[PDB]
Amino acid sequence: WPSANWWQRYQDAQLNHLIEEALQHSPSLCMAMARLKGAQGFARQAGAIRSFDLGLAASATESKVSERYQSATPPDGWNDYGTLTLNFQYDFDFWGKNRAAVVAATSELAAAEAESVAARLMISTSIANAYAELARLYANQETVHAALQVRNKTVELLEKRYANGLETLGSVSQAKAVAASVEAELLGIQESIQLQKNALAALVGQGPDRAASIEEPHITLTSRYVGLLGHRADITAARWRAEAAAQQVGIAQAQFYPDVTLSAFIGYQAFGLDHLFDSGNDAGAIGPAIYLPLFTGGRLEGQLTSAEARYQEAVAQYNGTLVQALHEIADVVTSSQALQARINKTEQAVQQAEQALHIATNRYQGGLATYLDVLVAEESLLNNQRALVNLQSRAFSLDLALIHALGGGFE
Amino acid sequence: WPSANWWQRYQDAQLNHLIEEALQHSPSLCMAMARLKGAQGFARQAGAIRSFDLGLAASATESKVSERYQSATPPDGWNDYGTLTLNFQYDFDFWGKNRAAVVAATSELAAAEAESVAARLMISTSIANAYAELARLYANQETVHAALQVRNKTVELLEKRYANGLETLGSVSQAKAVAASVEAELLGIQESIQLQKNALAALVGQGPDRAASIEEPHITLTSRYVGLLGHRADITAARWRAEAAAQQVGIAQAQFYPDVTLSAFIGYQAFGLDHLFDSGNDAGAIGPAIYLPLFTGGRLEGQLTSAEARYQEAVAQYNGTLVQALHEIADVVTSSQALQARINKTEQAVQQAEQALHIATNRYQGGLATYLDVLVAEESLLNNQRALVNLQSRAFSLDLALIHALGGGFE
Amino acid sequence: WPSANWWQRYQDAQLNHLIEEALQHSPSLCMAMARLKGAQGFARQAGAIRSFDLGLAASATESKVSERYQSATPPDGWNDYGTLTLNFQYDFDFWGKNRAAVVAATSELAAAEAESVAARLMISTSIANAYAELARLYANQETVHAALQVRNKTVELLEKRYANGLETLGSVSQAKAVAASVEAELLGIQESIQLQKNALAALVGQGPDRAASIEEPHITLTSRYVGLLGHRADITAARWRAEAAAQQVGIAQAQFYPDVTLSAFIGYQAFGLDHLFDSGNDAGAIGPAIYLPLFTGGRLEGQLTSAEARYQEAVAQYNGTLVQALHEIADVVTSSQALQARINKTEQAVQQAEQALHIATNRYQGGLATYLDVLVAEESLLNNQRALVNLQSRAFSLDLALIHALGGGFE
Ligand SMILES: CCCCCCCCO[C@H]1O[C@H](CO)[C@@H](O)[C@H](O)[C@H]1O
Ligand SMILES: CCCCCCCCO[C@H]1O[C@H](CO)[C@@H](O)[C@H](O)[C@H]1O
Ligand SMILES: CCCCCCCCO[C@H]1O[C@H](CO)[C@@H](O)[C@H](O)[C@H]1O
Ligand SMILES: [Hg+2]
Ligand SMILES: [Hg+2]
Ligand SMILES: [Hg+2]
Ligand SMILES: [Hg+2]
Ligand SMILES: [Hg+2]
C-alpha cells in the first residue's frame, strides 16, 4: 500500500524534488522536529522523579541569638557561623505514584513521536495537494487556450462573411464578446497558476524565487491493486495520550497514600568560620520521613475528579479520532467508487458536444445553420471539457486522499 | 419558542433518532461531559483553600551534631531520633482573598455548566444542519433525475425524427450531450448524498455502517408564530468568566495585605526511638503567624496589573459575545424576512419556464420551432427548479439558524 | 507607502467613521489593549526577580518541648513565645540567570507591543475588506437592477407583439421566466447587502442598529506610485519571541551553576510574649548561602533540552512568518500585475456583448431576428457586466491586500 516516499509513485521528479526540499529543511519541518525534541526533554525531566538528588550547600552567617528565647546558654552578641554540606534526597515510591508519572511522560513522548510522523504526512500531502491543483490549473489552461484559438478562428470567419454580406454584425459582435470572455477566463487561470506556484514555494519553505522554476506537472497515475487504521499516527497518538491520562488517575489515587522519603546530609557546621573544619565539627544525618494527608478539604479529592475527567476526555478524544478516521476512509471509498461513472458520462457529453459543434460549423461553413447553433455548441463543448479535466484531476486528488486517510506509509 | 428537544418539531423520526443517539453516547458528548466534570474537580480543589488541613508526619533519623556549632552541650556521636506528629494548618482569610478564590472557581464552574449546554446545542444543530443538507441533496436528486427522464425522451424523439429526415444530426448530438451532462450531474449529486450520509454517521459517533441505514428525510416545516438573548449559554459563560476575573483582581489586591495563618501540631519526639512514647516526650504547639510583604520589586504590583488586564479582557470577551449574538440574530431575521419574496420570484421563473418548455416542445412535436428553443427552455427550467429547491431547503436552514441564534431551549 | 490612517486615502468618510469607531471603543480593540496590559504586568512581575524582597513576620506560639529530644535543659510544660522580624532576601545572579529572565520577559513585552499593532491592522483591514464587499454588492445591485428594467421592457414589447399576432406565447413565457429570475437575483443581492451591513455593524462593536445608517460606499481608488518587510508586526513579534527563547536557553544553562543568595533578618524573639521587647531579646542574622546541584537525574538536563527545543521552534516560527509574509506580498504583486489585462478583456466582452444586444433588439423591433438572439445577447451582456464589476472591486481588494501584506503604516 502507501510507500514511505509514496509521492514517487507519480513519476514526477518535480513533485519529488518539492517534497524532498520541504522534508530536508523548511519551517514546518523544523517546528515538528522541535516539538519532538521538546517532548524528549519533558520525558527526561519526568524520569528524574525516580532518581535520587544530590546537591552541595554552604553558608556563612553573622548571627545574634535572643538571650531568652530557645537557648538557656546562648552565645553573646553577633557571631560568625559557617556550614558546608552534601545533601541527598530520595522519594521511595511505595505506591507507584512516581513510576506512573514516568509512564505518563513516556506515553506522551510516544504520542509526540507519532505526531512527528503525522507532521511529515501533513507536509508531504499539503505539497502534493497543492501540486494536484497546479496540474488541474495547467489542464484548464490548455483547454481554455485551445478553445480561445477556435473562438478567434470563428470571429475571423464571421468577419469575412459579414464583409461579403453573408452574416450580420450582431453575430460578429457576439463572437467577439465570446472570444474576449474566453481570453479573460484564460488570464484568470494564468493568474491562478502563478498564485499556485507562489503557494508551492511557501509550502516548501522558500521565498517566491523558487516559484520561478516551477513548471507544468507531469503526473503518472496508476490504479493501485477498521483493520486499515494502523498507519494512522493520529490514532496512535490519541491512544498513548489516553494511556498517559490513565496513569495520571493512578497518580491522583496514590496521593491519598503515605509518602515515604529519605534524606541525608554530611558536612561541617561551626561557630567560627575559621573552625569549620575542626575535629568534631562534622555533622550528618540520615533517615526516612513519612507524610500521610488526613484531611485536605477537597484538594486530593478534587484532583482525583479532575484526573478522572481528563482520562474520560482522552478516551473520548481517541474514540472521536477513530470515528473521524473511519469517516475519512469511507469518503475516499465513496468518491473513488463514484469517479469512473462520472468521468464516463462526462466523456460522453464532451464527445457528443464535439460532434454537435463539428456538424454546426460544417453546416455554417455551408449556409444551413446559424451562428447561434455554433455558439451553443462551442459553449456546451468547453463547459464539458472543463468538467472532464476537473474529474481527471480528481482521480489524482482521490489517490492523495487515500494516502492521507491511511496515514501514509512511514515505516 | 425553541423546545428542549426542539428537533422534534420537524416530525422526522429519523432526525430524532440521529440526534438522540448522539446525545446518549458519542465522542463529542463524552468530551463535553468530561470537560464539565473537570471544572467540578477544579471547583472542589479550589474550595479546599477555605478548609483547614490535617496530616500525619513521622521520621526516624540517625544524626551526629557538630560539637561547636549551635549547642553548648551536644550529644556525642551518631544517635537515633524519632518523631511522630499530627500537623494542622489553617489560613484565616481576613481580607477575603481565599473566599474570592472560591468565588472565582465556582464562577468558572457556572461557566462550564453553560458551556455543557452550548455543547449539547453544537451537537444537535451540527446534526440538524447536516440533515438539512442531506434533504437538499435528495431534492436536487429528484429534480435532476426527473429532468434526466425528459432529456432521454428528447433524444429518442430527435433520433426518430432524424431517422425520418425531419431533424439534423447536430441536434441529435447536442441532445445526447445535454442528457449525458444531466446524468453526470445526477451522479455527482448521488455521490454527495452518500458523502453526506457518511458525515451524519460520524456526527453521531458512529462508523460508516450507520450511514447504510440513513434514508431520505421527511421534514415538516411549520411557521413559528436584545431581550432575546437569555438562552445564549455563550453569553452566560462569558458573564461568569468576567465575574471570575473580577474576583481574581480582588485576590491580587488582597495579596498586598497581611496573611494570617494558624499552625499546630501534637505528637512525640525523642532521642532514642525506643523512647518515642516515654512520659515527657510529647511535644506540641499552636499559634498564629502573620506575614506582610513590604517590598517585592514588582511581583505584587505586576500580578495586580496582569489580573486587571485579564478582567478587562474578559469584559471585552463578554461584550464581543453580545455583539456576535446580536449579529447572528440580526442575520436570521434579515434572511428570514427576505426568503418569501425570493421563493416567490423563483417560483414564477419556474412556472414561466415550464410554460416556455411546454410551448417549445408542442411546437417541436409539430414542426414550427427548432430543437434550440427546446434546449434553451429545458435548461432555463432546470436551473430555476434547482434554485427553487435550494430556497425551499433554505427555509429549513433558517429555522435551524434561529434555534442556534436563540441558543436553543434547554431548560 | 501605507499611511498610519491609510483608509483615509479612499476618500470615503463612511469608511473613515466605521474604522475610527472600531479603533476608539469596540470589543476587539479592548481585548487587544488588555492583552498588551497583560504582557506589561508579566514584565513587571519578571523584573522583580532582580530586586531584593522585604517582609514583616510575626508569630505567637504556645509550645511544649519534648523533655528528651534536642535540648538538655528544656523548659517545662506549655509556654508562650513570640517573634516579630523584618526579613530580607536577595539573589546574587552571578551567572546572569535572572537577568536573562528579565530579558526574556521584556522581549515578550516587545512582541506583545508588536502584536497590539497587528491587532489594530486586523481590525481596520477586516472592516475595509467587509466594506469592499459591501461596495461590490451595491455595484452588482446597480447592474442587476438596470438589467431588470430592461427585462421588464422586453416582456412588455413581446406581449404587445404576441397580442398583435407577431410573436409566440413561448417567447413571452421565456421572457417572463428571464425577468423573474433576474428579479430573484436582485432580491438575493439585496439580502446580501443587508447581511453585509449587519457584519460591518458587528465588526465595529455595535449592535444591528448601527447597520441601519450604513449607506452605499463611495470609494476613490488612486494608483499608488525582502526589504519590504519592516512594517510587519508579525515578523517583529516572532523575532522578539525567538530572542526570549534564546534567553531561556541561557537560563537553563545557568541552572547548572551555583546559586548564591543573601538572607537577613532583624527583630525580636522571646520566651514570654510580655518579654518580646526586653533588652537582649533582639535577634538578627545576615549571610550568603550557595547551592550547587550535583546530580538531579535528568531534571536540569531535560529542562535544557526543552529550552533548546523551544528556541528551535521559535526560530522556525520566525522563518515561517518570513516565508508566509513573502508569499502574501508575492501574491499581491501577482494579482495586481494580472488585473489590468483581465479588466481589459472583460471590458471588451461587455462592449461587444452590448453591441450584440443593440443589434439583436433593433433587428427584433423590425422583424429580422428572433427573441432567442435577444435572450442570448442579454444573458451574455449581464454575465460580462457582473464579471467586470467584480474585477473593478478586485482593484480595491488588492489595494487593501497590499496594505495588509506590508503590515500597514503604524509609526
Ligand atoms: C563527597 C565527600 C563526602 C565526605 C565529606 C565528609 C565531611 C566530614 O568529614 C570529616 O570531618 C571531620 C571534622 O574535620 C573530621 O574529624 C573527619 O575525620 C572527617 O571524616
Ligand atoms: C489524634 C490523636 C491526637 C493525640 C496525640 C497525643 C500524643 C501525645 O500524648 C501523650 O504523650 C505522652 C508521652 O507518652 C504522655 O505522657 C501522655 O499522657 C499523652 O497525652
Ligand atoms: C525597620 C526597623 C528595623 C529595626 C528593628 C530593630 C529591632 C531590634 O532592636 C532593638 O532590640 C532590643 C531589644 O529590645 C534593644 O536592646 C535595642 O536597643 C534595639 O536596637
Ligand atoms: Hg528544527
Ligand atoms: Hg531543522
Ligand atoms: Hg464522558
Ligand atoms: Hg460518555
Ligand atoms: Hg480594554
Ligand SMILES: [Hg+2]
Ligand atoms: Hg477599551
